[PDB]
Design a protein around this ligand. Structure first.
Ligand SMILES: [Zn+2]
Length: 293
């Protein structure tokens, strides 16, 4: 139609390809190899790719060799939409039931892999058929290296470090877009995306447009027509730092102890939860919106 077909098999394979490297922990070989892969994949689609490298400081003082990866399509268009996700994997499994796993990196299949894999498939479609507005795909680094449950000292703003850096130092001067859409944990079987509070406060028309498109397409069992909780995530820093109204599409459970999927920040954030039908619902909705709303 006006709108390309999101190939969920393809998105799933992009998730699997990330996970295959090993956990994408900043400073590791797996992180460097996966980042190189992500950059090359955006370039093959025809994006103008920027690799923003910066040394960021984690809550414990670790210097992180961070790399935000930006792919820009129709780069001279002043009218743009930002689509983003984090690509790092957490170095801890600090919600794992087994204390011997708390200090072990997780695969981050849903928490990292899913949003990036959905965006890779979206970007693949954009490369084949221009939507008529500029699109920037951003994979933000060092999102999930915040203070773990077993550390008692507090550090403000310890999450979303790559986004914090970019928002202050964008890849092009005074970068702006009409709106932003973050995908985070968009791969889990039977995921439920509620209207997140920061998204509504900053960008209710964007929320409404996306949730209505999802309903039009038949994905209302995923895009729940209800208010969710407030979630700390990369979009808050895009809102505060670049003044781009942005939303978060994220699996939320209003009755979970953490608000997240059962496997969040555990060793079970692995490929077994990833589901083509969930990826399809998220990805096709985003295509509908950027091409056709
Ligand atoms: Zn996480």
């Amino acid at each position: 139609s006006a709108v390309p077909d999101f190939n969920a098999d393809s998105a799933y394979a992009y998730v699997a390809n990330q996970v295959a490297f090993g956990p994408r922990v900043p400073n590791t070989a797996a992180h460097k190899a996966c980042g190189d892969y992500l950059a090359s994949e955006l370039k093959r689609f025809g994006a103008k790719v920027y690799q923003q490298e910066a040394i960021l400081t984690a809550y414990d003082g670790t210097k992180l060799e961070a790399r935000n990866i930006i792919g820009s399509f129709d780069p001279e268009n002043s009218k743009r939409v930002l689509l983003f996700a984090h690509w790092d994997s957490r170095p801890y499994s600090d919600h794992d039931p087994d204390p011997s796993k708390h200090r072990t990196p997780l695969d981050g299949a849903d928490d990292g892999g899913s949003g990036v894999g959905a965006l890779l498939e979206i970007a693949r479609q954009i490369g084949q058929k221009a939507p008529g507005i500029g699109i920037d795909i951003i994979f933000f680094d060092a999102e999930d290296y915040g203070t773990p449950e077993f550390v008692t000292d507090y550090t403000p703003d310890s999450w979303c470090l790559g986004t914090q850096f970019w928002a202050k130092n964008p890849h092009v001067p005074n970068y702006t877009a009409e709106y932003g859409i973050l995908l985070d944990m968009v791969g889990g079987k039977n995921a439920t995306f509620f209207k997140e509070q920061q998204s509504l406060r900053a960008a209710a028309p964007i929320v409404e447009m996306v949730w209505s498109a999802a309903r039009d397409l038949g994905y209302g069992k995923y895009f729940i027509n209800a208010a969710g909780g407030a979630i700390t995530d990369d979009h808050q820093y895009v809102i505060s730092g670049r003044n781009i109204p942005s939303i978060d599409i994220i699996n939320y459970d209003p009755e979970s102890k953490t608000g997240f999927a059962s496997y969040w920040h555990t060793q079970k954030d692995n490929m077994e939860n990833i589901d083509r039908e969930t990826l399809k619902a998220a990805g096709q909705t985003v295509l509908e919106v950027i091409y056709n709303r």
